[PDB]
């Protein structure tokens, strides 16, 4: 009963290996879960080094033969595209749910009752999901509350020293590009650029756009306040005669005469550009004139623009020019003859950071920029990738808070409560089945892995924190009031998640409980591992 070049596991051994292989991935991702987790380093073998605490980012770089972990990586594919954060939490819910069910499989329980017991408990969890959630107002004055929300995303991926630096940056990045109405928010308007040779604690927020190539000349002004931005599409580099010709010269002096004839085409355009500056606020104080000039610049025009204290730029990215049209407002001017003062825009203080290797020009202080830039600066390679992974996860975490009016407290507040609710509700209801109790109890015990994992990485006994929370929840029910309890990782005792400021998005936990239950149920449905096609 076999085929050549094929391997198969029969009876229940095919499922036990799939669960055991899933337990191996659990122990790997059990250490890095939460703000007390660990920062993993992976090596591709070509010399690349990446330090990331995110679950999905690690799974994409890792190669796994186990087909169970492949579906776990595919399960996290829909998590980042929807939730954007908490992929490690989903894996811990899938693995422990298989471990708790592994004990019941050895007792002779058919996996369908175990699978149906998880789906029935999933539908009951969604009913308790809407009862436990807290409705948050849509007012834009909640930035003070958003500071605690930003800390929930930041404290996980960093050492907590960069959180206070990134807290005002990430919070103000979303609110600036977002006008106040129902509408929605677009994170594409926030650009992320990086530069090395500096410390990570120097990270600052950029309200405008950061440009790559800066003006090179000793007489160009470094700081220009209240300058008019002009988008210039003409090429200011060296030009040639409009008709095909050649340079015939007996002496070097005659070569400059033939070259100057072609240089007058550029000089004729330079005279029309400088006339626009003197026309509008030429001698007026607190005024400036800056030339963008997407195309290049010849060395002769650098001296002409420097005498007038004009900031000149050349060789700009085509995509970055489309943002300057929205931020500054200046239209693209193709021809110099058609240049008009109505094309000129407006901008605030423009100061260029002078560094030998690279120079940045800030477009910031704009009337209607409608864009933001988060500049992540670090000396090493992993310092740039770690913070960028925290910002992209931080921007998407705050995004779901403003889009979805519902918010849930974190720090195991939903996991411990739902495990307590489903335990006492199944005994009072008894509407499913007597054999389903094993599937419902296994799901209730599988929800306690997260509060035990978070405190385990901190070093405190997960058994003592579990008893103190359950004793506090029982005392809260006897007092007839609403009191939310959560695990405090720093002190080790319980805490109020509303006062501490730990909050989780409603859309993140809704797809986490539903996603982890549906994927782990499909793993238990596997009868046999077939090898074919070779």
């Amino acid at each position: 009963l076999l085929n050549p070049k094929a391997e198969s596991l029969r009876r229940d051994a095919a499922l036990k290996v799939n669960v055991t292989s899933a337990e191996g991935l659990q122990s790997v991702l059990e250490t890095n879960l939460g703000p007390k987790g660990t920062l993993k380093m992976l090596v591709d073998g070509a010399g690349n080094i990446k330090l990331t605490k995110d679950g999905k980012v690690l799974l994409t770089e890792m190669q796994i033969q186990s087909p169970t972990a492949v579906l776990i990586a595919r399960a996290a594919a829909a998590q980042d595209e929807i939730t954007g954060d908490g992929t490690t939490t989903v894996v811990c819910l899938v693995g422990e749910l298989l471990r708790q069910a592994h004990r019941f499989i050895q007792e002779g329980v058919h996996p369908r009752i175990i699978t149906d017991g998880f789906e029935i408990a999933r539908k009951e969890s969604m009913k308790f999901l809407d009862e436990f959630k807290i409705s948050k107002t849509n007012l834009s004055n909640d930035r003070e509350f958003l500071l605690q929300v930003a800390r929930s995303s930041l404290l996980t991926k960093v050492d907590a020293d960069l959180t206070e630096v990134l807290t005002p940056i990430v919070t103000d990045a979303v609110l600036s590009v977002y006008d106040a109405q129902a509408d929605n928010l677009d994170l594409h308007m926030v650009e992320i650029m990086q530069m090395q040779h500096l410390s990570p604690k120097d990270t600052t927020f950029i309200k405008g756009l950061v440009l790559d190539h800066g003006g090179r000349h000793p007489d160009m002004p470094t700081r220009v306040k209240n300058a008019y931005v002009l988008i210039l599409n003409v090429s200011l580099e060296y030009e040639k005669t409009e008709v095909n010709s050649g340079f015939f010269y007996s002496s070097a002096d005659q070569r400059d005469k033939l070259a100057a004839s072609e240089r007058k085409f550029v000089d004729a355009k330079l005279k029309k550009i400088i006339d626009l500056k003197n026309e509008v606020c030429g001698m007026d104080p607190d005024k400036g004139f800056v030339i963008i000039n997407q195309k290049g610049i010849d060395p002769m025009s650098l001296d002409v623009f420097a005498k007038h204290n004009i900031l000149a730029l050349r060789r700009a990215k085509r995509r970055n020019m489309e943002r300057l049209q929205l931020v500054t407002g200046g239209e693209a001017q193709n021809s110099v003859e058609d240049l008009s003062p109505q094309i000129l825009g407006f901008s605030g203080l423009v100061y260029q950071e002078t560094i030998g290797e690279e120079k940045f020009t800030y477009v910031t202080e704009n009337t209607d920029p409608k864009s933001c830039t988060i500049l992540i600066k670090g000396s090493t390679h992993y310092a740039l990738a770690q913070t960028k992974d925290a910002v992209r996860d931080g921007l998407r975490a705050v995004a779901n808070v403003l889009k979805d009016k519902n918010i849930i407290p974190g720090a195991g507040a939903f996991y411990i409560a739902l495990s307590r609710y489903l335990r006492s509700a199944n005994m009072n209801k008894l509407g499913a089945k007597g054999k389903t109790k094993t599937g419902i109890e296994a799901f209730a015990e599988a929800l306690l892995v997260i509060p035990k994992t978070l405190v385990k990485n901190s070093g405190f006994d997960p058994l003592d924190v579990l008893a103190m929370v359950e004793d506090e929840l029982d005392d809260a029910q006897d007092s007839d009031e609403t009191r939310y309890v959560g695990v405090d990782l720093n002190i080790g005792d319980s805490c109020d998640p509303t006062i501490e400021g730990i909050w989780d998005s409603y859309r993140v936990l809704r797809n986490a409980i539903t996603g982890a239950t549906g994927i782990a149920s499909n793993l238990l449905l596997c009868d046999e591992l077939l090898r074919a096609g070779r």
Binding site: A6, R112, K435, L525, D527, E528, L530, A532
Partner: protein, 518 residues
């Protein structure tokens, strides 16, 4: 190289047993998922039986013969593909000790399976109950079993009306003792072929009798509607032709250019005179038509329609009667397209169409599918063929059988009682067939978590006392009645499940040696 002795009979049984034991978990709505490991990092987690069998590579030829049966069984009916393979594999497993340990000649077993095939089909006819196929409200509830739990569940009300009108369109009900019984001649493949039209609404989708074409009138001023249209079909296009032999045309003198220009108008006009000989009201050409032939046929009072596929012309001959003719010079006047209902060119979905339809039922038609997008049309497409396949089995005979293992047990009980009165050497393999009929509902018991020993013995006792309609529930897992709780299956699935499985099991027992050679 070669396999002799009784070991080759075991190799044929283990070949079918290996394929059967894998798909045992694919039966029922509670069927467990299966994980196939390819040499590539990818995997297939789906529980579809037909999708897994196509991805399994087998060595022994008897295992390939079982895969060839699944390819034919999947085309006849939509579901029950793995049921035939499991049934055919279990019969060889139950007859394994009789063929090997009992030292019984295989032809004795093969001849016994021929008698057990007829005896099993007679029991299904007695267990099945009559159903009204002319009731429109009853057929929508029968198709709904293949509708719900799918993406079309929201349109299920519109899907049942679209599937019922589609089955009633292709079918032709005729019977008599004069020319015989055609058995309604229902063919889903060729005659039910659908044309997906983007835009519109799912409710707006209609089933039209005729051939739908996307080509409009090729002339700006022409009659767009004909009262009594006459369709003429032909192959050779209308345009300037060339000589069949080597043709070398070198024109130098200025007065030699007009000679070819006059021949260009004559060669096109001669092709139009052959068409107008019957005085048709329509002209349909398989290939394109030159602009010259457009004006020549315009003066003849007929519409010109070019660029028609060959697969469509075969279906046009059913709705029209025009005989396919290759050369235009051979076109007979017997090809008149009379009895063509409507020529209406009315545009649907920002694309000019044409109507070849009529008031009669040739058993040929093109279903008009419209929806919210092209992805919705693809989901309706595959779901409409599966909905019609279930409705086809209902229209082939007014009988329905209880599912969930009730029909499987109803045959095993009557087979064990009838075999006791035969009193022959074939009596022993009949009990093996009855034991194989009990494994199909027992497989549902193993997938439902219930005790296969206790539930199977109690279910068999309920057939000898109560009715034969008591099956096993998928959702619950306890013995319940199928008729009262609304679980039914058509008989045609049961007819092809018993016949094809036993016939394939006989062919595997006929091979006692494997010949190696090209």
């Amino acid at each position: 190289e070669r396999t002799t002795g009784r070991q080759a009979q075991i190799s044929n049984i283990t070949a079918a047993k290996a394929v059967a034991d894998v798909i045992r978990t694919c039966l029922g709505p509670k069927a467990m998922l299966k994980m196939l490991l390819d040499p590539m990092g990818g995997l297939v987690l789906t529980n579809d039986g037909h999708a897994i069998l196509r991805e399994i590579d087998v060595a022994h030829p008897a295992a390939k013969s079982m895969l060839e049966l699944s390819r034919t069984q999947d085309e006849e009916v939509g579901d029950g593909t793995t049921t035939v393979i499991i049934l055919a594999g279990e019969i060889l497993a139950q007859c394994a000790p009789y063929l090997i340990e009992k030292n019984i000649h295989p032809v004795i077993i093969i001849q016994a399976l021929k008698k057990a095939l007829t005896d099993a089909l007679e029991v299904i006819k007695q267990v099945s109950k009559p159903v009204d196929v002319e009731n429109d409200a009853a057929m929508k509830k029968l198709i709904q079993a293949s509708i719900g739990t799918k993406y079309v569940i929201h349109w299920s009300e519109k899907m049942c009306e679209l599937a019922l009108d589609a089955v009633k369109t292709v079918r032709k009900d005729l019977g008599q003792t004069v020319e015989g019984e055609p058995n309604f001649e229902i063919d889903i493949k060729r005659y039910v072929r659908v044309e997906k039209i983007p835009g519109g609404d799912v409710l707006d989708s209609r089933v039209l009798k005729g051939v739908l074409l996307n080509k409009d009138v090729v002339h700006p001023k022409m009659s767009r509607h004909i009262e009594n249209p006459r369709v003429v079909l032909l192959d050779c296009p209308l345009e300037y032709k060339k000589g069949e032999s080597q043709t070398n045309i070198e024109i130098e003198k200025e007065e030699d250019w007009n000679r070819i220009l006059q021949i260009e108008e004559e060669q096109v006009q001669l092709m139009c005179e052959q068409i107008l000989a019957v005085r048709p009201t329509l002209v349909i050409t398989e290939k394109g038509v030159s602009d010259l032939a457009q004006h020549y046929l315009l003066k003849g009072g007929c519409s010109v329609l070019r660029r028609v596929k060959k697969s469509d012309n075969n279906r046009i001959a059913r709705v029209t009667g025009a005989t396919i003719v290759n050369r235009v010079e051979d076109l007979k006047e017997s090809d008149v397209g009379t009895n063509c209902g409507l020529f209406k060119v009315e545009m649907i979905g920002d694309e000019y169409f044409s109507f070849l339809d009529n008031c009669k039922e040739p058993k040929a038609c093109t279903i008009m599918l419209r929806g919210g997008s092209k992805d919705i049309l693809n989901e309706i497409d595959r779901n409409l063929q599966d909905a019609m396949a279930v409705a086809r089995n209902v229209m082939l005979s007014p009988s329905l059988s209880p599912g969930g293992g009730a029909t499987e047990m109803a045959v095993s009980v009557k087979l064990a009682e009838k075999a006791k009165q035969l009193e022959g050497i074939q009596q022993w393999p009949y009990q093996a067939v009855a034991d194989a009929m009990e494994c199909i509902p027992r497989t549902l018991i193993q997938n439902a978590g219930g005790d296969p020993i206790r539930l199977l013995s109690q279910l068999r006792a309920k057939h000898a006392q109560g009715n034969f309609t008591t099956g096993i529930d998928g959702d619950k897992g306890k013995i319940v009645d199928m008729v009262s709780y609304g679980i039914w299956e058509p008989e045609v699935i049961k007819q092809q499940s018993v016949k094809t499985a036993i016939e394939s099991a006989c062919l595997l027992l006929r091979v006692d040696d494997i010949v190696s050679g090209v």
